[PDB]
Amino acid sequence: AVMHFESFITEKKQNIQEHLGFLQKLYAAMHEPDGVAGVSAIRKAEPSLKEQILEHESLGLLRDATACYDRAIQLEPDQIIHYHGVVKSMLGLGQLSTVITQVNGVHANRSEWTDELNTYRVEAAWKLSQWDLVENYLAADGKSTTWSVRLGQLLLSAKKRDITAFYDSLKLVRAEQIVPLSAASFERGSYQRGYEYIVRLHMLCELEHSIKPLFQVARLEMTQNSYRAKEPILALRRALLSLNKRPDYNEMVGECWLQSARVARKAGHHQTAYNALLNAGESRLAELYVERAKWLWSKGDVHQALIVLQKGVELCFPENETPPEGKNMLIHGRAMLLVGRFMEETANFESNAIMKKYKDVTACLPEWEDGHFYLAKYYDKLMPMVTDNKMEKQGDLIRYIVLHFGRSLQYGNQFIYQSMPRMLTLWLDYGTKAYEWEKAGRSDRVQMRNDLGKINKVITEHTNYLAPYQFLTAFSQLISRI
Amino acid sequence: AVMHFESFITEKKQNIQEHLGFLQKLYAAMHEPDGVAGVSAIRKAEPSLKEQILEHESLGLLRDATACYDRAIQLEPDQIIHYHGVVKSMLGLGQLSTVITQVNGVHANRSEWTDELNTYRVEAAWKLSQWDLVENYLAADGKSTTWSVRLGQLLLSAKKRDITAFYDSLKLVRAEQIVPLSAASFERGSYQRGYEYIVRLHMLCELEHSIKPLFQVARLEMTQNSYRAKEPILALRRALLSLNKRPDYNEMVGECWLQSARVARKAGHHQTAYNALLNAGESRLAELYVERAKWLWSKGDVHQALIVLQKGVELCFPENETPPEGKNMLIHGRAMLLVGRFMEETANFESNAIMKKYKDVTACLPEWEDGHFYLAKYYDKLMPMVTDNKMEKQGDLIRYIVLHFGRSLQYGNQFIYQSMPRMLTLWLDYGTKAYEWEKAGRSDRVQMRNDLGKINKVITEHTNYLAPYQFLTAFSQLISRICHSHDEVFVVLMEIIAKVFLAYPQQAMWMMTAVSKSSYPMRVNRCKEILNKAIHMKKSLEKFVGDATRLTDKLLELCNKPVDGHFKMLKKLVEEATFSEILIPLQSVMIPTLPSILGTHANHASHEWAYIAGFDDMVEILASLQKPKKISLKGSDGKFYIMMCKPKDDLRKDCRLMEFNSLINKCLRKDAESRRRELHIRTYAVIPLNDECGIIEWVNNTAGLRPILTKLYKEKGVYMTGKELRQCMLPKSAALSEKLKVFREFLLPRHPPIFHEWFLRTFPDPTSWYSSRSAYCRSTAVMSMVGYILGLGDRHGENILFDSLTGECVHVDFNCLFNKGETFEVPEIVPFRLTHNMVNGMGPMGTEGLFRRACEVTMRLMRDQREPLMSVLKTFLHDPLVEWSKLNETGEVVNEKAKTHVLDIEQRLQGVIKTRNRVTGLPLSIEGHVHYLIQEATDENLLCQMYLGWTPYM
Predict the structure, then answer these.
(1) Which of B83, B96, B918 sits opposite A70 (nearest CB)?
(2) How buried is residue A471: exposed, middle or buried, by Cβ count under 10 Å (0-12/13-18/19+)?
(3) Which of B432, B814, B822 is nearest to B661 (CA)?
(4) CA-CA distance, B147 to B157, in Å (whole number)?
(5) Measured between CA atoms, how close is B937 to chain A, in angstroms?
(6) Under an 8 A CB cutoff, do A102 and B101 touch?
(7) Nearest C-alpha in B relative to A306
C-alpha cells in the first residue's frame, strides 16, 4: 500500500488533506505509531470519531483515553471496538476490580455480543487473585481466544493441577503464538518487530521452570533473573510483570506477600521512566506494608519525575519510619536504607537546604559501603559545583579531596561511569597549568606542588586498583595530554 | 469534639501520632479539607485503605481517584461507600456513558444491594441525551434522599410537561436544600459554607424561568447573564454549569447547539484554573464543532495551563482553518476569532519566533479591533522589555510609542487596568529626570525636550478622553512625584490632578493634606498652587477646600497638645467642638479605595458613608511612653469611629500598604481558594497629616499580644526580672550556642499553651470558637507572607491586635520594612513573627494544620499575579516623599536602595530565596516554598539570635 500510496501523491499531486484520513489506517494496523503522530502534523480538520481514537492508540497516552472512548458512546451503540478499548484503558490504569463491576454492564444489554466477557473479563481477575469468574466466563471457549485467554486456562489448570492437561495447555498455545512472528522474517530488525511476541514467548518458559516444584526438582530460573535484560518500553514489559507477580501467589510461604509487593514495585521502577504516568497511581498502591523503605523510596520517584520535589523530599522523611537512630544491624535492609539517602539528594534542585547538610549526609553515606556504585559519584559532583564558585583557581585544596572519590568509588564500581574518569584525568590536568605559571611567575607552589604530590599518591593507588580495561574510554584523552 | 480535642492534648498529653487516626474524621464530614492534609502530614504509616481514601476524597484531586478505590475493593465487599465513591469519580471525570454500563454490573453481582442505582445511577443521562433509564431507575423513590436524585425527577416530568408536579416537586426540594442551611445561622460569614446550597438554589430557577414556553411568553433569567455571578472555583460551579447544559435541547432551533458547545466551552473556560485537568479532557470533547475558532482557541489554554506551550502554538495554526487571507468580515467571530490571535501571547515566552513578528502579530490586532479591552495591554509589556534592551536610557522614542498604547488603549478598556497607570505615569516620570540630566550637561536637549514635549502631548489627549475615575486608582502615586522640577510635566500634572480632583474630591480631600503641611516647603509652596488652578474651577467646592485645612489645622493640635501632665474635647478641643456647616467624609478605609468596573457600562464610577457630625465626649489617653490618645468621632449616623493622634514618625509609608493590602484583598476576593477559607487582611486607614504624623483608624475589640501575654500568664506568674531576665543576653559576640541555652533554660519558664487557653478562656464554646481559629490561622498566614514579601520587621508583642470576637489578626507599625529589619542593630532574619506561642494558639495539630494550606493560597495568588501586583511597589520604592528619616531645600530624592529592593521582592515572588551562596537559581514550587519558610520561624538556631525587645522568647 504505502509503496503505492505516497507514490500516488507525487504524480497528479492531489494533495494530502483531501486524501488524508485513509492514510492513518495504512499506518494504523501496521502498528507504525510514529506515522500516526505524523498525520495530525498535516491534518487540517482534526475532526472525527475514528481518527481521534486512532491517534490515541498510537500516542501512548492513556489518561484521556477513556474520554475519547466515552465520545464514541456519546455517538454510537456497542460496535465492539469502542467498548473494547474502554477496558483496555481501564487496564491502562490497571483497574481490575472496577472492571469486575464493569463486567455485567454489557450483558445487561448483551450489547451485540459476548466478546468483551471473552477478552478482559476472561482476564480481569487473571491479574487478580480471583478465578471464579475466570473459570466461569471461560464458557464459550472458542469465541474467546486472545493472548490472555487460553493463557487464562493455564492458571485455572494450575489451580486444578491436571498434570497431562496442564502440559497440554502449554503445548496447546505456545506454538500458536509464534505464528505472528512467523511472518516473512526479514533481518531488518526481524528480532525487533518481534519483541512483543518474543516477550510473550519469554513468559511461558517462566511458567515451566516455576510450576514444577509445586507440581510433583526444578528450582531455578527464578522469577526475576532474566528480567534485567529486557527493553524498558514498559508498555511492553508490564505484560510480564503483573503475570510475574502471582506465581509467587500461586506458590506460597517463603513469604509470598513480600515479593508480590516487591515485583509490584518494579512496575513503578520503569513507570517513572517511559512514563505512562498515571498508572504509577497504583504502583504505589499495589502494596501493603512490605519493605517500607524501598516502597517510600520509589514513591519519591513519582514526584521527582512529575513536579513537586518537596512532596518528594518531605515524604522522603517517613524515611525516618524506616529504622531511625541506631539499631542499624540490617545489612541487606541497610543496602537500600542508604539508597534512599541518596535520593534525599534530589534537593540539590530544591535549594535552601544548607550547603553542609548534603555535604554531611552524602559524605555520611560513604561511611557505609565503599563499593556500591551510588556513593560518591554524586558526592563528587556536588563538590566541583562549589569549586566553581570557590576561589579560582590557585588555592584548590579540594582537588585532593575529590579525586579520591572518582577513583575510590570506581574502585568498587564499574557503572555510573563515563563522565567521571574524564574528570579524574581532567582535574589532574585542571591541576596542571596552574603549576607552570606558579613555576614561571609565582611562588604559591608551596602547598600546590606538594598537593599535587598528595594527588599523586591517589593516582598510583587506583591506577593499580582499576583494571586498565576500565581506563580504556578516556585513554584517548590520556594520549591528548602527553 | 474538636473544641474538646486540642484541649485534650495540652493537659494529659496523649501524644499526637498515637491518637491521630481518630482526628481526620473530624475534618472529614465537616468539609474542613485543609485540616486533613496537614494532619496526614504528621501521621507516619499512611496505613489504611480508608484513610488514604479520606486523604483523597478530602483533596478532590480526581485524576488518580480510582486507584484509591481499586485496592479498596480488593480488600473488601461492597460496604457501600467504596463502590459509592467509585461512581463519584466516574462522574467526577464525567465518564457518563461508561457509567451507564457501570450501572448495570451490580445488578448481576448484587454487591450487598443494587442501591447505588438510587445514588448516582439515577443521574447518568441526567446530563446525557437519554432519559429512558432515568424513567426506569426511578424505582426506589423513598430511597431517593439525595440532591440530584430528587432533582432527577424533574426533567422526566418536565418533558412530559406535568404542570402539577412541576412547581410542587420544586417546593419539595426547595425546602430540602434549606433544612441543612437552616442550621442556626451563626453570622460569622456563614454564607460561604453556605454557598453550595445557595448555588443549589440558583440551580432550580433557570429551569422554572425557562420551561415556560414549552411548559404551556418569556424565557428570562438569562442563563449566561446570571453566570458571571459566581465563583470561578469550578469545583462548585460546574454542577450549575452542567445544569446550564441541560434544558438547552429542551428549547430548540434558534441554534440550541451553539450553547451546548458554548457552555461546554464555558465548562472548560474555568477548568484551566482550579485544575481538575484531565476532567477538562471531556470539556475539550463534551462539545460540538460550533465555531471552531472559538473552540480551537480553548484547547491550547489547557496546554498553556498544563505543561507544553509549544503544542498550543502548534495548535494555533489550525486556527487558520478559520479564515485568514480574505473572508475577514466576521465581526461576531471577530469578537473572538481575534482573541486567539492574542493568545499567541503563549508564543511570546516560548522564544524564537522573531521579535518584530510579535510586534507585527500583536499590533495587527488593535488595527483589527480598536475597542476590545485587551488591545495593547499585552502589546504594552513587550515594549519595556525592548526599552532596557535598547539604549539605556537616552534615546527612547518608544516611550512616546508606548504611552498611546497605555492610554488610547484604555478608553476602550475598563478592567485589566491596575498594572498600567503606574507605568503610564511612571514611564512618563521616569522619562522626566533624564531630560534634566540632559539639561544638567548633555547635548541632545534640542531633541529630547521636543520628544518629551511630544510625550507631554500624548498625555492630555487621553485625560480629556478618560474619566478621572480610572486616575483615582493611582492617586497617591499621582501625588507622589509633585517634585518634578521639570518643565511642562508639573504643568500637565496641574491639569492632570485638577481634572482628577474636579470629580470625587471628597476622598482626595485627605490625601492633599499630608503633603500640604509637611516641613519640606518646596512641596508645600508647590502644593498650594495645585489647589489654585483646580480651585479656579471649583467654586462650590472651595469652602470644604478651606474647611479641610481648617479641620487639619486643629487636627495638628491633636498631636501638638499632648505635653499635658485623661483630658477632654471640652477642655481644649473646643475649637474642634465649634463646628458649623461642614461635611467631610470620615476616612472610611472601604471608601477611599476605589472599586474598578467590568462590563462596558461607561463609566458611572460609583462607590456606595458619612460626615463628621460632632465628636465623642472625652479623650482617654494612653501613655505607652509616648502619650497617644483615644479619640472617637461619633459619625453622622451615630456609629462611633475611633481615631488615634500619633506622636510618631512618618505614616506616608503606611498609607500605601493600606492601598496595597486592599488591592490584594481585591484579588483575594476575586479568587476564592481564599474565600473558601475566608481570609482578608484587616485594612484600616491611616491618613497622615505631617511628616510628624496624622491619624490612625483605631479598631475596637482589640488587645495586643503582650497584654494577652500578661494576663493568664500572670496567673501562672510572669518572670519579671527584666534585665535580670536578660542577664546573659550579651551583644553578638556571645555564642548563639550560649544564647540557645539561656533561651532554652528560660523557655521552661515561658509556657506555650496559654495561647490555646486564651483562645478558650475568653471565648464561648459552641462553634464561634471554631471559625475564630479558622480566622486565626488564615488571618495570620496571609500577612505573614504578604509581610514576608514586603519584608516587614519588628512584629512586637505590642504590635499585633486581635478582635475580641473574631480574633482576626491585626498588623500595625509598618515602619520596620523591607530589610530595615535586616539593616537593624540586631538584624531580624526571622521572616515573620511566629513564635512557639504563636504556634500553640492554633495549637497541637493546628501546628501545621490549616496554616500551611492557608499559606499555600497566599503565595499562589501572589505568584499568580506577579506583574499586576509588582510595580505598585516600584512606585512605593520610588515615592520620594518617604523615609530615610535623616533639613535642606532639595528634598524627596530617592530610596537609593530601591533598585536593589526591586529585586528583593521579584525573586521572592519568583519563588527564589536569597541565593544561598555558591548555588544557582532554581525557583521553588509554592508548596515547596512555604515549608522552608515555615521552619524559618522555628529556627531556634536563628531564633536565639533575635532582638529581645521584639520578644521572640514570647
Answers:
(1) B96
(2) middle
(3) B814
(4) 17
(5) 15
(6) yes
(7) B307
CA distance B421 to B838: 40
In DSSP terms, B285 is beta-bridged to none
CA atoms within 13 A on the CB side of B196: 10
Would the CB atoms of A349 and B922 count as touching at under 8 Å?
yes
Q: Is B175 exposed, middle or buried (0-12, 13-18, 19+ CB in 10 A)?
A: exposed
Give DSSP secondary structure letters for A79-122: TTHHHHHHHHHHHHTT-HHHHHHTTHHHHTTT-S-STTIIIIIT
C-alpha B742/C-alpha B588 separation (Å) is 47
What φ, ψ does residue B695 adopt, rounded to 5°?
Answer: -125, 145
Contact state of A103 with B98 under an 8 Å Cβ cutoff: no
B146 contact partners, CB below 8 Å, separation of at least 6: B118, B119, B122
Nearest alpha carbon to residue B282 among B96, B103, B62, B85: B96
Between CA A54 and CA A24 the distance in angstroms is 8
- Distance between A386 CA and the closest CA of chain B, angstroms: 6
Q: With contacts defined as CB-CB under 8 Å, which chain B residues touch A321?
A: 44-45
How far apart are alpha carbons A453 and A447 in whole angstroms? Answer: 9
What does the DSSP assignment read for B125-189? GGTSS--HHHHHHTT-SSS--SHHHHHHHHHHHHHS--HHHHHHHHHHHHHHHHHHHTS----SS
Handedness of CA A108, A109, A111, A114 (dihedral sign): positive
B343: closest CA of chain A, how far (Å) = 19
- How is residue A445 written as a grid cell? 607552589
Which has the closest alpha carbon to B681: B817, B821, B781?
A: B781
B680 three-state secondary structure: coil
The residues, ordered by sequence, that sit 6+ positions from B226 with a Cβ below 8 Å of its Cβ are B202, B206
Contact B919 A100 (CB under 8 A): no
Task: Report the length, in residues, of chain B.
Answer: 954
Contact A103, A90 (CB under 8 A): no
What Cα–Cα distance (Å) separates residue B44 from each residue in B393, B557, B845?
58, 63, 14
Q: Is the bond preceding A454 in cis, omega lying within 30 degrees of 0?
A: no
Nearest residue, CB atoms, A44 vs list B63, B282, B318:
B318
Identify whether the C-beta of residue B902 lies closer than 8 Å to the C-beta of residue B866: no
Residue B630 φ/ψ, nearest 5 degrees: -80, 105
- Entry field: residues in chain A: 482
B contact test, residue of A129, A242, A348, A351 with most B CBs within 10 A: A351
Asked if the Cβ–Cβ distance from A93 to B66 is below 8 Å, we say: yes
Residue A55: exposed, middle, or buried by beta-carbon count in 10 A (0-12, 13-18, 19+)? buried
CB B340 within 8 A of CB B296: yes
User: Is-contact B128 B177, C-beta < 8 A?
Assistant: no
Q: Which residue has the cell 479498596?
A: B72
Chain A positions touching B924 (Cβ under 8 A) are 310, 350
Grid cell listed for A4: 503505492
Checking A262-271 for CB contacts under 8 A at 24+ apart, the result is A262/A290, A262/A291, A262/A294, A263/A223, A263/A224, A265/A294, A265/A295, A265/A298, A266/A227, A266/A241, A267/A238, A267/A241, A267/A242, A268/A298, A268/A301, A268/A302, A269/A298, A270/A232, A270/A234, A270/A237, A271/A234
- Establish whether the linkage from the previous residue to B630 is cis, with ω within 30° of 0: no
- CA distances to A151, A421, B285, B805 from A49, rounded to whole Å, are 33, 56, 11, 60
Cell 544491624 locates to: A329
Tell me which of B66, B86, B95 to substitute to probe the interface with A (most A C-beta atoms closer than 10 Å).
B66
**Is residue B884 left, alpha or beta, with left meaning phi > 0 and alpha meaning psi from -120 to 50?**
left
* Closest Cβ opposite residue A282 in set B70, B128, B282: B70
Q: By the 8 A CB rule, do A114 and A141 touch? A: no
Closest C-alpha among B244, B239, B238 to residue B261: B244
Which residues lie below 8 Å from residue B853, measured CB to CB, with a gap of 6+?
A: B34, B37, B38
